[PDB]
Amino acid sequence: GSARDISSTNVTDLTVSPSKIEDGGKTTVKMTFDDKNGKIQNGDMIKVAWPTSGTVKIEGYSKTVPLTVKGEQVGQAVITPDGATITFNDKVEKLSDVSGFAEFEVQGRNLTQTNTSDDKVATITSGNKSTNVTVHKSEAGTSSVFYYKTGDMLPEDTTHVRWFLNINNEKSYVSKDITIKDQIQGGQQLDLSTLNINVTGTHSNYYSGQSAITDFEKAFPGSKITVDNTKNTIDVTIPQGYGSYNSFSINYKTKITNEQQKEFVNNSQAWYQEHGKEEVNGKSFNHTVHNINANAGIEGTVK
Amino acid sequence: RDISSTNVTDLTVSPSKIEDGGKTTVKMTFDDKNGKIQNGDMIKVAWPTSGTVKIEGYSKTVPLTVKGEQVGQAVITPDGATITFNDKVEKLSDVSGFAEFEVQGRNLTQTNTSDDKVATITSGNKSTNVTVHKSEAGTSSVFYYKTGDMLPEDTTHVRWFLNINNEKSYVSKDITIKDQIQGGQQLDLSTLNINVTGTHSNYYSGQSAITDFEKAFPGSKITVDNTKNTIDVTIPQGYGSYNSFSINYKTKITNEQQKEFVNNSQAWYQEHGKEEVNGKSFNHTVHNINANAGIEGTV
């Protein structure tokens, strides 16, 4: 099973949709190829490369889109946060005038450890063609947010959606008990084995795996995490005697049951009071996470 | 060192009676007869900053210069005017200077009909009276009107507003407007913002403001030529109905000595029931601000 890196001979164009993105932003990368300069054989590979280390990091979302024509898998697009590689099968050695593409979403990251508004460029390469992408890191805002909800999708895991219940982020004294109800919407399924609590401050500790819930409830006398599996409901109550001077980060991954669903929602309510600031009673903190778009088309003529 | 009380000779206000939004030249004069002016000496001219009558000082910085020597500095702020003297003034013996600047007269009285409230401007120990007039709202249901202004905090750029379909009524023809920005000023594309209110409620500002408006409202197009200073806005009748479009931009002044700034427009609209309008001239003019400061001394 021998292979060839035919990217330098067969790549036609390399398109990147948004040439200017923000830090952590998504980017549509399109690679076009044809056999007008060399016939595509079994083992042939098109390799798409990008900066993987330093101040500019480019992380492609892990997806697998097969190049299929008339029910025959002639190739396959393999996407990895460190590089994309397209491998063709022996089922293509019977087609002529072959021309196709590999379109996928890639996360752009700015890692310049310097103050003030910053712009940094990243050059994605595929064969002869190379494209420049700008990633912007805006100046950091003032840290003054008590409770908020955030969902994440890792380039190393596109099957699960990360959810974060960040409580008392500024280590502030909490005047009331912190109660948060959570309703996970359709298209996904809650995984209990992933549920982890990351307390940071006076009573700092990381609780994860099996005993994760009970370890938190025992260590913080009064605290309660309640999970409904089928309904996808997580109700968490933390006492004020432990909520003060501590940042509670509740993280859980939800297994995607529908890849065709374009975005994922999770609704949450909050009950808290930061000492000095005003109290919150049942305010809705809802967050939406976008899925990943990826395609790989191929045209060919038989006989 | 505040020396306003012991040096101000006369405080003067030009137009005594003005309308709500009018401008007023305020002259201040100081002497050296009642004591020497030194380094760190301050002359303050104060006016009502909040209430029924608000006075807004147009932001300017005019230096007190005598024969190639800047002995003082006069700064105007929408809250007060401070005149600071440098160490270079401690060479002159007989000093007599002035500082005249324009301020905005505002009548914030929220009461029924015509209202006249006096605003008293103070400088040291001298006082003056300014009458501001509110003139009651009308029944003028203008479809398309153009009006610009200059903010007392920003005197370097000129605001211009393109208010389309203000009474958000049914429209029978695609609304088209042409904008011709005149000389002495330059278009700033960053300040160009769109504000939609009515059936559709949106506000697009900065950078991609034009693109975001064109994407969200299919059919609508804003043609901006930067070097020639020409804006052409075309909105389809399907979106132009029941929506008030507010297109505002700032125009950077490239001529501080210019007397007034002009801006022309041509409207193309058919408001259902009323008359058809084809290429009618909707022109507006913004008045410029004049600020002066002069010092007179002898060795």
């Binding site: - | 009308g138 029944t139 203008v142 507003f161």
Partner: peptide, 30 residues
């Protein structure tokens, strides 16, 4: 042994784009 906790939440976003210019004033008389 066991791997570490997930990283600390990133620096909060920028600042909201300045509000729209206010509503137009009352119409004038004669």
């Amino acid at each position: 042994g066991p791997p570490g906790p997930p990283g600390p939440p990133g620096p909060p976003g920028p600042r909201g784009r300045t509000g729209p210019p206010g509503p137009p004033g009352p119409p004038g008389p004669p």
